[PDB]
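DATA SHEET
Item: assembly model
Revision: 1
Owner: S.N.
Input lines:
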Amino acid sequence: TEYWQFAELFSQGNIVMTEKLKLTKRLVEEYRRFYQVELSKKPSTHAILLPLSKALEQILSVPDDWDEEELILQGSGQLQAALDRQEVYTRPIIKDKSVAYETRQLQELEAIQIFMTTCVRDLFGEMCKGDRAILQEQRNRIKSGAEFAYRLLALEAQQNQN
RNA sequence: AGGCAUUGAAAGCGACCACCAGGGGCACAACAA
């Protein structure tokens, strides 16, 4: 929380930074609807960021000619393919067998889709101006900021659930 | 030894898998005259 209050402090007069800090929390607060590694098991950064690392690696690797509205479908496909390679306990929407499979699938596909839509629309399209150089220089600062955002959301959940 | 007759239908793949982890700075120099 200390290092978040510093980011929230340096951003106070600048909209483009305040927007990026709000977006970086929202971006993970969206993927935390469908993927949750438990911090108690002492996980890697690779784990905490699995959907963000596969959203960015797909946006950056695909040819620069292709549209945002196709990038979202191929990236949500890869996220769906990647989630099916993890162990089941990390997937909040599938893991509750209390609800029917065809609706667990519908909630997973829309939770992945809305996240992939935020990464391609708001991260790449809006904030990074649709430029792969500007996203490639930010890649690692986004990943660090998202790791702190994931820990802040997890701390906030484990407190406010009382 | 003769005439004859050197083939013929069909099939031309089928299933699944298209990755996995972990790293994402490390050291120092911020003025000199």
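QC remark: Residues 44-47, 81-82, 85, 139-140, 143-144 of chain A lie near RNA strand B (CB under 10 Å from a C1').
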